[PDB]
Amino acid sequence: TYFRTNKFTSAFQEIVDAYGVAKYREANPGVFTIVTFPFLFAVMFGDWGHGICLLLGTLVLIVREKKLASQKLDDITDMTFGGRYVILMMALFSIYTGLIYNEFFSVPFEIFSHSAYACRDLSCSEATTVGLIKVRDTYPFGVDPVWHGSRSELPFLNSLKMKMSILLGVAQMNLGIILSYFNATFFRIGVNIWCQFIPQIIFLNSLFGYLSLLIILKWITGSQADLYHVMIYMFLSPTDELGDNQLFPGQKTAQLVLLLLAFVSVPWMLLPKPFILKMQHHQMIHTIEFVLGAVSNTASYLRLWALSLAHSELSSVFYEKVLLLAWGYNNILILIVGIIVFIFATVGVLLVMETLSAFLHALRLHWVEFQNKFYEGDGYKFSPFSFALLD
């Protein structure tokens, strides 16, 4: 079978078909991915300036598609013509992503106030002081430039980005579990659904959710020295006892109980379904597959964090080159030459190289999420006798 797809849905359908097909009754998450992959790619990376420019170019292409229908595209241009709408949606999401990142045109910009974030007190004290900076006013539309974009703010910001990516991966896994439950409801198994999907889901979900809730509790408490590694320090002891840093008063005993529950659920993920089948009368693949999937989700979160850090580094390099060209040019000619060279280099790095790399990484992450989620391949497209030349 093949589902009906609009012009925007065409690219999502192409990506889903590349990731196999599914049964006619089997749910197709291609429509959901048509937003999720933009949702992850926006979280993955984004440049406000060139990304807006890329979106404008894609919109111009969509407007001129009437001629592009007549004008045959060349190689990757053909795929671009099909996926223009999806690319535009992804760029639209990346716009809000950059707004969160506050690096407008790959450069921090003040929001609302003259300076979005500043240093309260320490009028004479340097930024490298015990008092250092105090953000009396915090940027409401994005990360505070003092707390993120400044010289020494990079490590804590990167740690926070990685911590947030971990939660995003947990949410993606939960969405996949929800999709699996929906498919099971569509599958309509009287008790086999509870025996198979419920144990396979929820177990690793709560396993990672313990750490996610620990991160939330840390954000509430605001511990400083451990940075984002307080969770690592806590989880470093899978054994009982100790647990001094535990924010929740009962976090230690509850964590031990949760570990025991996960250990008990680990066979429950595998054993019940073959037992029910034998009573009526793969799991070996499902074996260790949960641990591998959790590792893959952690890998996706780490990849997103690394992509964001790399994009920030590239933006910083471009800004440094532009500043060097502008400052060291009393004459207009040197400044113009440097600006043109920097613009060309930054365009090539971001709109082509970084953009393609981020798109590929996001596609890989979405494919992993779908494979863990559902639709299990195993299908093909509906076959009508359409006139290929005419249609």
Binding site: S383, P384, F385, S386
Partner: peptide, 27 residues
């Protein structure tokens, strides 16, 4: 939401039906 279906096309009428259904068709 598809299902199997069969249609018996008369031999003489087969050409016209094929020509009509050629554009998009169903199966």
């Amino acid at each position: 939401p598809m299902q199997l279906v069969q249609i018996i096309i008369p031999i003489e009428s087969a050409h016209l039906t094929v020509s009509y259904l050629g554009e998009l068709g169903l199966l």
